[PDB]
Each structure stands twice: as structure tokens, then as C-alpha cells.
Design a protein around this ligand. Structure first.
Ligand SMILES: CC(C)c1ccc(CNNC(=O)c2ccc(O)cc2)cc1
Lengths: 11, 225, 224, 13
């Protein structure tokens, strides 16, 4: 989920 | 020197990371292993960001992006350390301020692991491996991660293929004196996979012993699939 | 077209062997594991003699010849299994008289390992692996085996080079419709290595548990 | 040793 979150992040 | 795809892979370069070891206290196996796990945790943040700039990576479903990273994360970590250690001799650059020699590996209980990493270093030394090649193998290793939980196989294979091609164009471009160099490069990946697995198993045992604090990201990768 | 190394490797390709399981002995896991080891053990004799027919291999020191075989043996065993299993589905042809389906893998405590090998099988099926490619890759596997103990690094590298070049030619000649096919083949080696290790470690644990008798050669290769 | 012997011995298929 942090992996996921970090993958869902930005720019 | 320019391939399009390779230049996207150089985004994170040049990398710098520090352990900032505390000299206030004596070094122990626990201290050294903690440092490494901390470094690993933080590099993974860099690795994650670098992967997003891989053309095609972000286009995969998230579960698939996760699947590949979960299979290939240690291979990428090891590959980095390997590259940083190229101009050194029987030492591993885990950070710019944390260079492990045989004694330090012995203290950490990592002689066997760090040796294997040095074997990998040795091989890339005599091939005189380049920034460009290094970043490309990372992406290949990632794409060729051999996960068994891939939703869209054709996309992942398309990506393997795109990266493979990037590597061919680059060696064709830059190393005509050896028409197989791409092949030789690809032939170093088995040792990378092997070493990775040795590292993961070892650090998994370390997690279970429960004596070494580990941050969330590193644990997530360690405990997956 | 013709390639000299590929032709030699095809011809050196050895004959079938058989598991010859005891029909008297009851279907347990130690029966399965014992058969596989006796087989493996006899299969190693074949591999040893097969290595020698690889162009350049005998030219190496006896020490290097051992080192390579000591690193690669399980990869070669597995590649054998994989190849035999390409005409099947979700089963592994360990020998012609010993084929393991999923249920039989469970019974022997080999589901995970055999699934990984199956993964290998399915990849080569999706690529339509030809005999010519298979024998070349098996040779490359041996030569690219990454032993820590190599005396003459340049000779072994030569042997890698030679074997590699042959694959390049074969794919250049037979598969111009895929100018990357050779590299795609090489990129299957990681999973081979990984599966080899998984297997070495599983069977090493079994050796340690002491319940499965193992013939000498097998043990000697296992403890290396 | 057994590996060595067999390398040194001849292939009898
Ligand atoms: C074995 C495993 C737990 C592991 C721990 C720590 C690393 C760190 N890699 N750090 C680097 O890649 C790097 C070094 C020095 C730079 O200047 C930049 C980056 C890898 C793998």
C-alpha cells in the first residue's frame, strides 16, 4: 500500500 | 551517444545517497544491518520514481507495476550498489559514506552475500560497464522480472521488447568493436537474479530474527508474494 | 542454414533414461523423492559425458570443467525436464516412465518447485523453442554458470563467446522475422537460474532430513 | 573425485 501509494503519486 | 529510451532511464542519475554513520557508538552487526536496511528503504523511493519514467511502465495497471517491482526490487538495488563499486577494489559502495570492506562484511554477517556482489562487480569491471548500460539492465531486469501475477502479459513483454531494443541500438551505436556485447550484458542477469535471491532470503531471515529495525517500504517489498 | 556448433550439440544430445519406480513400493512422498534422486543421479553421468562433446569444453582444465559442472548441473537437469515436457500441459516429464501432474507434485511436496519449472516450460512453449535453440541454450547455461572458482577466466569466456555466437548465427539464419529472438532466449536464463537454486535448496534440505537415500554423485554435486 | 573420475572415464552410451 505504500508501494501502491508511491506508485499512485505525482511529479 | 543518443538513444531516446536510454535518456529517460538516466533521469535519476547521478545518484547520491548517504548513511551518515554515527561514530558516537561502536559499530555492531545490528548497527550495520540497520544502516543497510535504511539505505535500501530510501533507495527504493528513488527506484520507484525512476521506474515511473520508464516509457510504458506507468501505462500498465497498478497491480502489474507492483508485481514487477515486487519481483525485481532487490535486483535493482544490488545492481546499483554494483555500479557504484566499479572503480573500487574488493569494497562495496552501499552509500557514498558507507563503503563495506571484507572486515565490515564479516562484522555484518554478509561475507557470502557481498562476495557474490563482488563477483558481479568483477564481471562488469572487465566489460567496462557504462552508465547507459547499467540503467538499461535495471529496466530490463525489472521488465524481465518473471512475476507470476501479471495481469497483462503482452504489455509486459512489449516493454521487455522495447527495452531489449533500446539496448541493441545502443551497443550497435556505441560498441561496434564487439557485435555480441548486448548478449554479454544480458548474460549477467542470471548472476543478478541469483544474488538478489540470496539477499532477499538472508534479509528475510533477519527480519524474522526481529533484532533489526526495518522501515515500512523495505518490509512491504520483503514480505510480498 | 548450417551452423557448426549447433550441429555438434544436436549430435551430442544423449538418449532417454527411465525412472523405473518400484511398483511393489507404496505411493508415498519418499518413493517419489527417491526415484527422482536415483534418476538425477544417473542423469548426471549422462550430463558429465555430454559436456565433453561441447566444442571447447574439453580444452579447459579439468578443474574448470568441474567448476562449471558443479555450478550448472541442476540447470541442465531442469532444462532436460523442461524440454521433455513441452509437448505436455501442466505436467513434467521427469522421464518417459515418470510424469508428474499437479496432484502428484503435492503428494511429493514439490508443488512450488514444479510450478516454477512449469513456468519455464510455458515460456518456451510460447516462444516455440526448437531443438536447435534448446541444445545451444543448455550449453550456454553450462558455460555461463558463474562459478566462483574459475582458474582460466579467458578460456571460459571464449567458450561463452563461441556458444553465444552460434546462437546469434542460428537465429540470424532461421529467425530474421525476429532480430531479437536470440536475446529473448538468453533472457530466459535468469528464471532457469532461479529455479535451479530453488531446487538445489529444496533437495539440500531433504538430504539434511536424512530420510531419502541418495547415490554418491548426486550427493557430491549437491554439496558444492 | 567421482565427478573427476567420470570426466576422466570414457562415455559409454
Ligand atoms: C542488500 C540490500 C539490503 C541493499 C541495501 C542497500 C543498498 C543500497 N544501495 N545504494 C545505492 O544504490 C547507492 C549507493 C551510492 C550512491 O551514491 C547512490 C546509490 C542496496 C541493497
Amino acid at each position: 500500500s505504500l508501494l501502491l501509494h508511491l506508485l499512485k503519486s505525482q511529479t | 551517444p543518443y538513444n531516446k529510451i536510454v535518456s529517460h532511464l538516466l533521469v535519476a542519475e547521478p545518484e547520491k545517497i548517504y548513511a551518515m554513520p554515527d561514530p558516537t557508538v561502536p559499530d555492531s552487526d545490528i548497527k550495520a544491518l540497520t544502516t543497510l536496511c535504511d539505505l535500501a528503504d530510501r533507495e527504493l523511493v528513488v527506484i520507484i520514481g525512476w521506474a515511473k519514467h520508464i516509457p510504458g511502465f506507468s501505462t500498465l495497471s497498478l497491480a502489474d507495476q507492483m508485481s514487477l517491482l515486487q519481483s525485481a526490487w532487490m535486483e535493482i538495488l544490488i545492481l546499483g550498489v554494483v555500479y557504484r563499486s566499479l572503480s573500487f577494489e574488493d569494497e562495496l559502495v552501499y552509500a557514498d559514506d558507507y563503503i563495506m570492506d571484507e572486515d565490515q562484511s564479516k562484522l555484518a554477517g554478509l561475507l557470502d552475500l557481498n562476495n557474490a556482489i563482488l563477483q558481479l562487480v568483477k564481471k562488469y569491471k572487465s566489460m567496462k560497464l557504462e552508465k547507459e548500460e547499467f540503467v538499461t539492465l535495471k529496466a530490463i531486469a525489472l521488465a524481465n522480472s518473471d512475476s507470476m501475477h501479471i495481469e497483462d502479459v503482452e504489455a509486459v513483454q512489449k516493454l521487455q521488447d522495447v527495452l531489449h531494443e533500446a539496448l541493441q541500438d545502443y551497443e550497435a551505436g556505441q560498441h561496434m568493436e564487439d557485435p555480441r556485447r548486448a548478449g554479454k550484458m544480458l548474460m549477467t542477469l542470471p548472476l543478478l537474479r541469483q544474488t538478489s535471491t540470496k539477499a532477499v532470503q538472508h534479509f528475510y531471515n533477519i527480519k524474522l530474527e526481529g533484532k533489526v529495525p526495518m522501515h515500512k517500504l523495505f518490509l512491504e517489498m520483503l514480505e510480498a508474494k
